[PDB]
Amino acid sequence: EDPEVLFKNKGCVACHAIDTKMVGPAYKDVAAKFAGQAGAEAELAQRIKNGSQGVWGPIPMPPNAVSDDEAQTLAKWVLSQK
Amino acid sequence: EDPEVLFKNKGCVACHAIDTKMVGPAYKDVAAKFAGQAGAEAELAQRIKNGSQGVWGPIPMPPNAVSDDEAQTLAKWVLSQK
Ligand code: HEC
Ligand code: HEC
């Protein structure tokens, strides 16, 4: 099997990242940054779906092929990180 | 859909972790630690399959339900992190 496929399928993602510094911000840090903002869930869902740039650094996030509902589910989950 | 399921299925894992500090060591750090050791791939495959404890801290890694071949594939990939 492809190893990235196994990494996801075999539960490793719960406990490990490739790097302490991934290209995008860690979700716990995203959650903390938004702690004083209402409407974080809607904003993040839009960013997740459509892509975004310039908030955390010069590296863009491309759009993601997710539905509105999927984007909202993911935004809520990012915001649920403790 | 479950959000952890979407996180894996929609490609987010390539660019984000939940936390800069996951319970287990980051794979780039594992790769660097083993740079002077022959037989790292076999050692890591065994750790991945069987679990391990006490190398990085007090939190154990439980066994993972992987085949020998899957464990080797994953060990090789961990070691391929740059
Ligand atoms: C899913 C199959 C994987 C893969 C590929 C790896 N793990 Fe873990 N892991 C966890 C912890 C707490 C540790 C440190 C244990 C200690 O201090 O001894 C590890 C360690 C590793 C390593 C490095 C092993 C070494 O001896 O250097 C590697 C390569 C590794 N893991 C890969 C914690 C977890 C989990 C928490 C519940 C889960 C799930 C996994 N690991 C799963 C995987
Ligand atoms: C898969 C569907 C996901 C999810 C759920 C998220 N991303 Fe990304 N992301 C990346 C980068 C470089 C950034 C920073 C962009 C900037 O500086 O503006 C982001 C940002 C985010 C956020 C925070 C958005 C904010 O405005 O604060 C969130 C919640 C987020 N992402 C979730 C990089 C990548 C990728 C690299 C190629 C990929 C793939 C994804 N992101 C995918 C996802």
Residue numbers in the entry:
A (entry chain A), B (entry chain A): 1 to 82
Please give sentences taken from the publication describing this entry.
551 molecules exhibited domain-swapped structures, where the N-terminal Glu1–Met22 (helix 1 and loop 1) and the heme were relocated from the original position observed in the monomer. We have calculated the root-mean-square deviation (rmsd) for the Cα atoms of the regions from the N-terminus to Asp19 and from Val23 to the C-terminus between the structures of the monomer and each protomer (protomer 1 and protomer 2) of the dimer. The rmsd values of both regions were less than 0.9 Å. These results indicate that the structures of both regions were similar between the monomer and each protomer of the dimer. In addition to these hydrogen bonds, a new hydrogen bond between loop 1 and helix 2 (Asp19AOδ/Lys28BNζ) stabilized the dimer. The Fe–His16 and Fe–Met61 bond distances were also similar between the monomer and dimer.
In domain swapping, a protein molecule exchanges its secondary or tertiary structural unit with the corresponding unit of another molecule of the same protein. A hexacoordinated heme is attached covalently to two Cys residues through their sulfur atoms in cyt c. His and Met residues are coordinated to the heme iron of cyt c in its native state.
